[PDB]
Design a protein around this ligand. Structure first.
Ligand SMILES: *[C@@H]1O[C@H](CO)[C@@H](O)[C@H](O)[C@H]1NC(C)=O
Lengths: 45, 50
């Protein structure tokens, strides 16, 4: 299950912004570890 | 279920299907075939006193 929210903000901010349900995927696998993917640009120099 | 299906003004979110009252009983339904919200209200009933 992936839940998401985009909040316009001026530490983490105060107040409430509930995350809406985005997708429920019928995967059925074992998940114990995770890692974030970043994008890197080639230099060309 | 047995009830009257009426038009609703409840702003359901796209994920949301069912609707519930304080009793956690179905109060609205979103149809798969046509994506519209039908409010469910129990039909009229009462006690008869002679
Ligand atoms: C058939 O159902 C799908 C989803 O349940 C819906 O998107 C589609 O509009 C329906 N077909 C017609 C002709 O309404």
């Amino acid at each position: 299950k992936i839940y998401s929210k985009h909040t316009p903000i001026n530490d983490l901010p105060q107040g409430f912004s509930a995350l809406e349900p985005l997708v429920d995927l019928p995967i059925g696998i074992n998940i114990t570890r995770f890692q974030t993917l970043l994008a890197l640009h080639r230099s060309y120099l | 279920g047995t009830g009257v299906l009426t038009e609703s003004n409840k702003k359901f979110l796209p994920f949301q299907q069912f609707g519930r009252d304080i009793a956690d009983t179905t109060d609205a339904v979103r149809d798969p075939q046509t994506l519209e919200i039908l409010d469910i209200t129990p039909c009229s009933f009462g006690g008869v006193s002679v």
